[PDB]
A paper describes a structure:
The key determinant for efficient animal-to-human and human-to-human transmissions of coronaviruses is the spike (S) glycoprotein located on the virus surface, which mediates virus entry into its host cell. The coronavirus S glycoprotein is a class I viral fusion protein that exists as a homotrimer with multiple glycosylation sites. The S glycoprotein comprises an N-terminal S1 subunit that mediates host-cell receptor recognition and a C-terminal S2 subunit that is required for fusion of the membranes of the virus and its host cell. The remaining S2 trimer, which is conserved among coronaviruses, undergoes a series of conformational changes to trigger membrane fusion between the membrane of the host cell and the viral envelope.
We produced the post-fusion SARS-CoV S2 subunit by subjecting the pre-fusion S ectodomain to trypsin digestion, receptor binding and low pH treatment, and determined the cryo-EM structure of the induced post-fusion SARS-CoV S2 trimer at a resolution of 3.9 Å. The final structure includes all domains and regions in the ectodomain of the S2 subunit (residues 688–1178), except for the fusion peptide (FP) and its downstream connecting-region (CR) motifs (residues 754–900). The structure of the post-fusion SARS-CoV S2 fusion machinery comprises a long central helical bundle surrounded by short helices and β-sheets at the distal end of the membrane. The HR1 and the central helix (CH) motifs fold into a continuous 31-turn α-helix. Three HR1-CH long helices intertwine with each other to form the stem region of the post-fusion S2 trimer with an outward orientation from the membrane side. The HR2 motif and its upstream linker region bind into the groove at the interface between the two HR1-CH helices of the neighboring protomers in an antiparallel manner, reminiscent of the six-helix bundle present in the crystal structures of the HR1 and HR2 motifs. During membrane fusion, the HR1 motif turns over to form a continuous stem helix together with the CH motif pointing toward the target membrane, which makes the post-fusion SARS-CoV S2 fusion machinery extend ~80 Å longer than the pre-fusion S2 trimer. In contrast, in the post-fusion state, the linker region no longer folds into the β-sheet with the SD3 domain, but is turned over to the opposite direction and rearranged into an extended structure mainly assembled by loops that bind along the axis of the stem helices from adjacent protomers. As described in the post-fusion MHV S2 structure, four highly conserved disulfide bonds (C720–C742, C725–C731, C1014–C1025, and C1064–C1108) are identified within the post-fusion SARS-CoV S2 trimer, which also exist in the pre-fusion state, and are located exactly around the UH, BH, and SD3 regions which are more stable than other motifs during membrane fusion. Our structure identified 8 out of 9 putative N-linked glycans, which reveal the distribution of the glycan shield covering the surface of the post-fusion SARS-CoV S2 trimer.
Author numbering:
A (entry chain B), B (entry chain C), C (entry chain A): 688 to 753, 901 to 1178
Write the structure that this text describes.
Amino acid sequence: AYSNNTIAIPTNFSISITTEVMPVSMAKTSVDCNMYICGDSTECANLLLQYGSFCTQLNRALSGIANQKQIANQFNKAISQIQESLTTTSTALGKLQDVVNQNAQALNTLVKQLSSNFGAISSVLNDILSRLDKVEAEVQIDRLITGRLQSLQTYVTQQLIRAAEIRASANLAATKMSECVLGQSKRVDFCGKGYHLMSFPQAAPHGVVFLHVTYVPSQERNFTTAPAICHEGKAYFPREGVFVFNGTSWFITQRNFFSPQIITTDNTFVSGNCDVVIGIINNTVYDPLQPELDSFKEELDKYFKNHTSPDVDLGDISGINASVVNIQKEIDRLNEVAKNLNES
Amino acid sequence: AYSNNTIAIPTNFSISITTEVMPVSMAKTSVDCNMYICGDSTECANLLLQYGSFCTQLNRALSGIANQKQIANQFNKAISQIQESLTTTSTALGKLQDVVNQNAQALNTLVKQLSSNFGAISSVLNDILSRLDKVEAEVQIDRLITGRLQSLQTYVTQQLIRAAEIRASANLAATKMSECVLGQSKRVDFCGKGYHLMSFPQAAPHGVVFLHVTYVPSQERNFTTAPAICHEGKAYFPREGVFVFNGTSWFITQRNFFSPQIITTDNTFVSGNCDVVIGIINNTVYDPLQPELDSFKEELDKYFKNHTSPDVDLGDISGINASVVNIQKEIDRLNEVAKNLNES
Amino acid sequence: AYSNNTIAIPTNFSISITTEVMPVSMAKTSVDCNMYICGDSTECANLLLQYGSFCTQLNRALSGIANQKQIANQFNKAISQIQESLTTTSTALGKLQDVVNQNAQALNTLVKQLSSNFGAISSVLNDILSRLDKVEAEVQIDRLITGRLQSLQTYVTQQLIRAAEIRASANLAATKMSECVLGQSKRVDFCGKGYHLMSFPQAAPHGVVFLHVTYVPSQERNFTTAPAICHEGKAYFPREGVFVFNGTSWFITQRNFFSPQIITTDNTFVSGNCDVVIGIINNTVYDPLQPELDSFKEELDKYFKNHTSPDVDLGDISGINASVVNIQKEIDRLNEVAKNLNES
Ligand SMILES: *[C@@H]1O[C@H](CO)[C@@H](O)[C@H](O)[C@H]1NC(C)=O
Ligand SMILES: *[C@@H]1O[C@H](CO)[C@@H](O)[C@H](O)[C@H]1NC(C)=O
Ligand SMILES: *[C@@H]1O[C@H](CO)[C@@H](O)[C@H](O)[C@H]1NC(C)=O
Ligand SMILES: *[C@@H]1O[C@H](CO)[C@@H](O)[C@H](O)[C@H]1NC(C)=O
Ligand SMILES: *[C@@H]1O[C@H](CO)[C@@H](O)[C@H](O)[C@H]1NC(C)=O
Ligand SMILES: *[C@@H]1O[C@H](CO)[C@@H](O)[C@H](O)[C@H]1NC(C)=O
Ligand SMILES: *[C@@H]1O[C@H](CO)[C@@H](O)[C@H](O)[C@H]1NC(C)=O
Ligand SMILES: *[C@@H]1O[C@H](CO)[C@@H](O)[C@H](O)[C@H]1NC(C)=O
Ligand SMILES: *[C@@H]1O[C@H](CO)[C@@H](O)[C@H](O)[C@H]1NC(C)=O
Ligand SMILES: *[C@@H]1O[C@H](CO)[C@@H](O)[C@H](O)[C@H]1NC(C)=O
Ligand SMILES: *[C@@H]1O[C@H](CO)[C@@H](O)[C@H](O)[C@H]1NC(C)=O
Ligand SMILES: *[C@@H]1O[C@H](CO)[C@@H](O)[C@H](O)[C@H]1NC(C)=O
Ligand SMILES: *[C@@H]1O[C@H](CO)[C@@H](O)[C@H](O)[C@H]1NC(C)=O
Ligand SMILES: *[C@@H]1O[C@H](CO)[C@@H](O)[C@H](O)[C@H]1NC(C)=O
Ligand SMILES: *[C@@H]1O[C@H](CO)[C@@H](O)[C@H](O)[C@H]1NC(C)=O
Ligand SMILES: *[C@@H]1O[C@H](CO)[C@@H](O)[C@H](O)[C@H]1NC(C)=O
Ligand SMILES: *[C@@H]1O[C@H](CO)[C@@H](O)[C@H](O)[C@H]1NC(C)=O
Ligand SMILES: *[C@@H]1O[C@H](CO)[C@@H](O)[C@H](O)[C@H]1NC(C)=O
Ligand SMILES: *[C@@H]1O[C@H](CO)[C@@H](O)[C@H](O)[C@H]1NC(C)=O
Ligand SMILES: *[C@@H]1O[C@H](CO)[C@@H](O)[C@H](O)[C@H]1NC(C)=O
Ligand SMILES: *[C@@H]1O[C@H](CO)[C@@H](O)[C@H](O)[C@H]1NC(C)=O
Ligand SMILES: *[C@@H]1O[C@H](CO)[C@@H](O)[C@H](O)[C@H]1NC(C)=O
Ligand SMILES: *[C@@H]1O[C@H](CO)[C@@H](O)[C@H](O)[C@H]1NC(C)=O
Ligand SMILES: *[C@@H]1O[C@H](CO)[C@@H](O)[C@H](O)[C@H]1NC(C)=O
């Protein structure tokens, strides 16, 4: 750089109060989560019970801010053969009576007690449906609560960052009530704008209101300005000074205004050369270090189950029919032989 | 303002060391989530596996801090009619045998294989109950984990805000090891209280302990003090000075103590008027901008299912009975005719 | 402390530009959650719909940054007794016909309509399985989303803390464009290293690049240095000075270099004693107040259900058999009597 250029250097001034305000404390922002999250749907209050005791410690942080007898005997034999036949028929039909009734008893057993199986399975199935739907409903609510929860946590983080700004600004308030009040700071546009004379401190709800009695340049000039000059391979350093003309005569003044005092030997300092030392750059950087998230595919497929299956539950188990008898020609010929028997 | 008032202005001093401490670094607070979240219930460790790799990158941020033959033939015909009748009866009862046994075979089919249907449905229903209860249990755990998780995330946010305060305070430490150590700062109650002479820097675990050799006013006076005076519609500005009396004679002194030097022309600066310039107010404010959350009603009713339904599962399907035969008068009259047949 | 020691005090200087950079603003880091959370698995986008409107307000904060007739008649009576017997048999077998067919009708009723019960229960059971597996899948996804969500919320918190550092650093930029530009700050190694002469401000994308024309000590000496001396139980205070020798003769100089001006009476100030005032320690501390989390055992066992149960669903309800008739000796003797009847 090194070059002579021009800085507005003040000529005539004026009084100037400043009256700046800088906050020092914070309200105890005890924010209820149950109100910020939840407005209605008492269900939400039933589920945020299960969400920890997060709001307590959250507001703990926020609080910590602030020849023819042959016929007779033979057909008598035949009649006792018919006697054999009909006692035989009584045997058959008694067996049929007990077994057809036993299979009907098994039928009643199945019907009654298998209705009871239907009743048990149907009640269990309805309760499965009920609690499945409770799971569905509350799970959707939990999605919504979790998003709204991290929004609230962002609210609290925003609040804490404000609390940190307020703490550092109160440190600046303590430093200014040191220097501006209990001293006359020789710093341009600090302790209010212009050149500080005295400051008047006064309180506020959460601030410290300053009343800086200062003075500002009412009148000046765009005037030439040189940091250092190199006559002889040889630099010149104005102690508490800046190289200035009067219309082309090199003088050195104060910075605050110019009564252009002549170049002495004492106020100038000298280097044996005019060799610039190059300085270091680029401070105040911070690395965030929030590094990386991979896919859902990696994250999921480490820890995941697909896990489905249908049933079978055949039902052709039912589907086999009942064959029947519908014959009655036996009854027909039976009663027609009964006609024949009453005939002769 | 502008008015003459009174500031304690120092008279006699005393030596004063200060010995302040300002931290510069932080411990590597590698906080395990599995310990801060989880203390017991290995179940919790089974579920926090599924909770991402959040704790890794979380501690990455925290790490980045640091004639009578008629009879014979006719009744022989009738006897063969009875032969027809009993072969006919054999036909009927064989049909009944096969069909009653077939309906019993269908009954055994239903009983065996429909027990197998009950076994399949009951095992599936128990597994439905099992995994439903796993869902219920782990879902409640997930509520609790999510609340405790955001409490941990608040812990980390609190920690990072401390890290930011430490970084800015270490910037102040670098600035004070510049000015207090390598210079004699002309700043009241900076570089320790009082007026700095020299500071002695020394290390600490995570701080830089200063030893500010300063000097403080042991003796002073509540004494009158004026910023500027307006004789002639015309202001007066003491350069490095403050208007002071000796008991009513206007002098201007240093701020640091008063040897009340007389009003010169050079130390006073003058405005042509006494016109206050009014200054700007109210800096250092930040807008949080955390704006808004609506109801659960809006948020929910965009994306929600109620979604319930019962079954029917009739059971009168069972409830139709089995009619029976319980008659035996046929057997009674049958064996009584058998008595009659053995009679004659 | 109080002791005479040695500070490098400058002798000959050199010009030195500094060229430091301090950022003042931030890019509008409108970070999409749907990209930072979600990369693939459109399912994830189906579930993050249910996760509030968190990303909107999240980026609202981030945006707010920037003889043989006896025989005839008697056996005619017996023949009508057989007529009674076979009409009686017709009665029995008609009753058996209707009842065996009725129990078969009940069997068909059970088979058809109980297949319909199996169909209803099986379809409901498959849908239970389906939506249970949807619950399982999406619940695991919600674990993963919640962990990745708080990682994103940590990203945003990290970003906001950077925004606070940038706001305070821009306050330092405003203070340096006050003092370094519009003044000549008498502060060592502030407004760039060395001793400030003038600074040249120039813009940047998000910074304010300074060009501090300063001057640094090219040449100096480790030289003795005393804060205060106690001849007579009586201290000595060099105003804008430091006690210095020339090779053992006590002088007081400037801090910036040494032309060792003689000890006057005016530049030294005096205490009547040599009594050190001890100062206060250990500022800039903040209490985090993130206090406490108890066990899962406390947190859980306040609000938790274990809640399991099996079924019974007997199945011996089926398991009772069907007894049968398999007899046919009646048919055998029946047709053998039919042989006997056709004989005679
Ligand atoms: C400014 O600096 C130049 C050298 O760059 C010098 O020759 C000149 O005399 C200086 N003054 C003016 C008024 O240009
Ligand atoms: C010179 O004065 C003008 C007045 O209009 C103002 O722009 C500024 O003070 C100076 N101009 C420059 C530095 O370009
Ligand atoms: C600067 O110096 C004198 C005295 O201040 C002034 O009168 C004159 O106009 C200027 N120029 C010179 C001496 O060349
Ligand atoms: C640098 O120091 C030496 C030491 O005697 C002195 O002779 C010389 O004048 C100094 N240089 C300047 C420019 O003052
Ligand atoms: C300052 O440092 C950052 C580090 O990321 C770099 O990107 C930037 O280019 C540097 N500034 C200049 C002017 O090179
Ligand atoms: C297995 O999981 C993947 C993961 O997206 C998904 O497509 C589906 O639920 C399952 N089945 C198949 C065939 O991918
Ligand atoms: C009725 O009987 C059989 C038994 O094997 C069954 O499979 C089928 O459905 C029916 N038979 C027909 C319709 O011919
Ligand atoms: C059947 O025969 C009997 C005698 O065997 C006699 O009463 C009559 O002729 C017939 N009818 C009735 C109804 O008895
Ligand atoms: C204070 O200011 C008033 C004007 O407000 C002036 O008359 C007076 O002389 C000053 N001094 C004292 C000691 O009151
Ligand atoms: C005047 O001195 C008293 C001493 O008790 C003290 O309150 C303060 O220094 C002054 N009082 C004021 C300014 O009200
Ligand atoms: C203030 O000035 C003189 C000299 O310091 C002092 O003796 C006198 O008492 C004071 N008052 C006057 C001169 O009215
Ligand atoms: C203001 O500047 C003019 C310019 O010559 C000068 O005459 C006047 O004395 C100045 N005013 C004061 C109060 O110094
Ligand atoms: C400072 O600005 C804030 C902006 O919200 C305002 O509320 C407050 O009233 C201002 N201060 C004064 C003293 O008016
Ligand atoms: C539909 O959802 C609402 C939402 O609170 C709730 O009352 C219930 O689960 C459902 N039914 C009715 C009738 O509101
Ligand atoms: C048994 O039979 C009928 C079949 O239609 C059934 O509905 C009913 O329960 C029973 N009848 C009675 C008890 O009269
Ligand atoms: C039945 O009649 C037979 C001959 O027809 C004869 O043995 C007896 O009288 C009766 N009883 C028995 C048991 O046979
Ligand atoms: C340093 O201080 C001691 C007293 O501690 C004093 O006797 C001595 O003369 C001083 N100077 C040197 C050069 O040691
Ligand atoms: C004295 O000079 C040496 C030069 O090597 C350097 O270590 C430092 O400036 C001084 N040494 C100290 C203070 O121990
Ligand atoms: C310090 O003072 C004189 C004059 O600066 C110097 O010549 C001498 O060497 C020193 N020592 C004394 C006077 O003992
Ligand atoms: C302290 O103040 C008194 C008041 O007159 C004065 O006599 C004495 O000299 C002062 N002490 C010092 C060391 O100046
Ligand atoms: C500073 O205060 C903290 C408060 O926790 C304390 O632990 C520490 O020991 C103090 N420093 C010293 C040097 O005692
Ligand atoms: C009850 O809950 C506990 C909690 O860990 C767990 O062991 C299990 O799920 C249940 N049963 C028993 C016997 O503990
Ligand atoms: C078949 O009949 C009975 C009915 O009580 C049933 O309990 C059992 O399983 C069978 N009886 C046997 C195998 O003896
Ligand atoms: C049975 O007897 C009838 C007459 O009663 C006669 O036709 C024959 O002898 C026998 N066989 C058949 C097939 O009728």
